[PDB]
């Protein structure tokens, strides 16, 4: 207890990649955001991921990527 939560999560992971190997389709289920730009003038590649973060240790956030949206523009 207080450690079975981690080791059972492995036993979940034993199945999830097994269903990945069981389905050799074209994978319409996308599970990533394709061709989103990281930073370049040419290289707009390396499909991506989105999560959320939280509070304190504020600072003046220099490096952004978009004009502060939450969802997609339009």
């Amino acid at each position: 207890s207080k450690e079975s939560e981690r080791i059972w999560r492995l036993q979940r992971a034993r199945t999830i990649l097994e269903f990945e190997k069981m389905l050799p389709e074209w994978l319409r289920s996308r599970f990533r955001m394709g061709e989103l730009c990281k930073v370049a003038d040419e290289d707009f590649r390396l499909c991506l991921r989105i999560n959320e973060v939280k509070w304190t240790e504020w600072k003046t956030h220099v490096s952004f990527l978009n004009e502060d949206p939450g969802p997609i523009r339009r």
Binding site: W58, K59, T60, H61, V62, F64, E67, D68, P69, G70, P71, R73
Partner: protein, 135 residues
Amino acid sequence: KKKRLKKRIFAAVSEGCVEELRELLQDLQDLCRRRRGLDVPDFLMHKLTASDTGKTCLMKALLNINPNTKEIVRILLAFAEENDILDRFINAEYTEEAYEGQTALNIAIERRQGDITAVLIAAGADVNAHAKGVF
């Protein structure tokens, strides 16, 4: 010849801080005086603001910061004073109905830029702007 002055000022306020903007700042007075008595605040505001986003030439300087950005405002506030349209410009709310009503004041608080905040208040901005939207 459709000069890219709206495109040029946006790339200027990000990194080309002082000298490239002021060479563009002299260009805009040449482009407004030719009509010799037009609707003056209608034309100069449209050449500082995109149609869809409604973003000003101040707020694009306010999103990305730079350790020269105290200069980028005082040059831009003095130009809005020489055409006497600073008041409608400083209260130019975002009108793209995503996060509409978020003004040029509202960027200065959230970016924690305290020094250009009191500069932005000293021009007489509305401190009461309601911001509805997608959030």
